[PDB]
Amino acid sequence: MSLSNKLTLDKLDVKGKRVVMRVDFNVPMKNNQITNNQRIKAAVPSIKFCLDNGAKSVVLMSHLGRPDGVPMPDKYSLEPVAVELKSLLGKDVLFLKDCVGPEVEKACANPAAGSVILLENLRFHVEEEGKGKDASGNKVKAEPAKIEAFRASLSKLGDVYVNDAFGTAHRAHSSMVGVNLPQKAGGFLMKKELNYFAKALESPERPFLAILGGAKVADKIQLINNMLDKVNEMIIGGGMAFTFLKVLNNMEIGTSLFDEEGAKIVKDLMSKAEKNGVKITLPVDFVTADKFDENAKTGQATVASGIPAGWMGLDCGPESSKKYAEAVTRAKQIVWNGPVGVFEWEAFARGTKALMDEVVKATSRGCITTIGGGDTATCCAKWNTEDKVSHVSTGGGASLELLEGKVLPGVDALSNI
Ligand SMILES: COc1cc2nc(N3CCN(C(=O)[C@H]4CCCO4)CC3)nc(N)c2cc1OC
């Protein structure tokens, strides 16, 4: 599942070549400024390698948010990323106000040696995703000839193509699968990410522990099912736990998150766990709240006491953290996708923070620890543990596709060796 069969950047001859590189620069924003640059830094090694090995230019392309194929320069512009990238590179970045057309092509045709260029959001064009919404809010499908022309234009921007956009690798979008150049290479971030998950999924050090949390469970079914064939141990925490608790223990869970459809398959999941010899760890106690608010009134519950009606479980308790800690301590490899409580609120972050402490300690004694993207990675940013675990994935949705046993279109479209 690694890039072993695919052309990679390190094997790419880029001296005197223009490199058009798809990156995932879809960073979280607030008020026109970046609040997490993790995805930008993650791409720096590929960019730096190109500049260091005599590349004539590196033309960077990405999307930002979901403008749905309409230009939205005042809401979703990549301009700020240009500024941040220049800061990280110690080098000028030229921002272009479009990503195709004659003028874009002319700026990229033959740039001064060492030029870094960043194009405007790819998704301002419906041809990128192949569908979107018009100015009026009607859903639209892109036209075949225009899609090819969009792709033909992106292709003109470089002599060789690098995809470093792991976070977007599950999207079969034009910049990801439709660039037509003789060499199509995986970048250093693509290789890194794929190497971490490939080992986790094919050849992990064992016991292999999966920590699965976050809110809803229906979207987690094929995920749990698939992981049950890979792991030796699984923590099921956060929002999903209450559906299990209710089915398995007849727990009264108040207004806690509950997934009726998922309830139907919980016993089958547990049978599968048992059959495969997977130890499942569910929480046994909770921090409760009288409503979904950062300031709600709080309380405590266990599985036996139940959660009072009107109240909801928003975090696991001290005893739960203990059991989580024990599974972590046994692990030699860990993939963690989903916090185990409402981490962004102080009253409900103890469990996720405590788990993070264990995962860092686990890393310190040699455990391979993989943090999926999304909220979990945000937690790493929040508590400054980005360099204290083995790998913080840049791809939450993409890493999830891999954990479910699915293929990544962005990877398959790379040149074969
Ligand atoms: C224990 O772990 C978690 C529990 C979570 N619970 C919730 N909800 C969200 C919304 N909920 C409610 O509004 C209550 C009150 C009205 C409906 O039931 C139910 C509790 N949301 C979340 N986002 C939750 C996330 C969690 O971990 C990440």
Swiss-Prot record:
For the modification N6-malonyllysine, the affected residues are: K131
| Keyword Cell membrane among record annotations | no
Q: What happens after mutating V266M?
A: In PGK1D; with chronic non-spherocytic hemolytic anemia; variant Tokyo
Q: Which residues are noted in the entry as AMP-binding?
A: A215, K216, K220, G239, G313, E344
Keyword line = Acetylation, ATP-binding, Cytoplasm, Disease variant, Glycolysis, Hereditary hemolytic anemia, Hydroxylation, Kinase, Magnesium, Metal-binding, Mitochondrion, Nucleotide-binding, Phosphoprotein, Transferase
Q: Which residues carry this modification: Phosphoserine?
A: S2, S4, S203
Q: Where does ADP bind?
A: G214, G238, F343
Q: Which residues carry this modification: N6-succinyllysine?
A: K6, K48, K191
**PTM annotation (N6-(2-hydroxyisobutyryl)lysine): residues:** K97, K216, K220, K323
Which HAMAP family does this entry report, sorted A to Z? Answer: Phosphoglyc_kinase
The miscellaneous comment for this protein is:
Dysregulated mitochondrial targeting of PGK1 may contribute to the elevation of aerobic glycolysis seen in tumor cells, a phenomenon known as the Warburg effect.
Family to which this protein belongs:
Belongs to the phosphoglycerate kinase family.
Give the quaternary structure. Monomer. Interacts with kinase MAPK1/ERK2; the interaction is direct, occurs under hypoxic conditions, and promotes its interaction with PIN1. Interacts with peptidyl-prolyl cis-trans isomerase PIN1; the interaction is direct, occurs under hypoxic conditions, and targets the protein to the mitochondrion by promoting interactions with the TOM complex. Interacts with mitochondrial circRNA mcPGK1 (via its 2nd stem-loop); the interaction is direct and targets the protein to the mitochondrion by promoting interactions with the TOM complex.
What this protein is called in its record is Phosphoglycerate kinase 1
Q: Which organism is it from?
A: Homo sapiens (Human)
**Gene encoding this polypeptide?**
PGK1
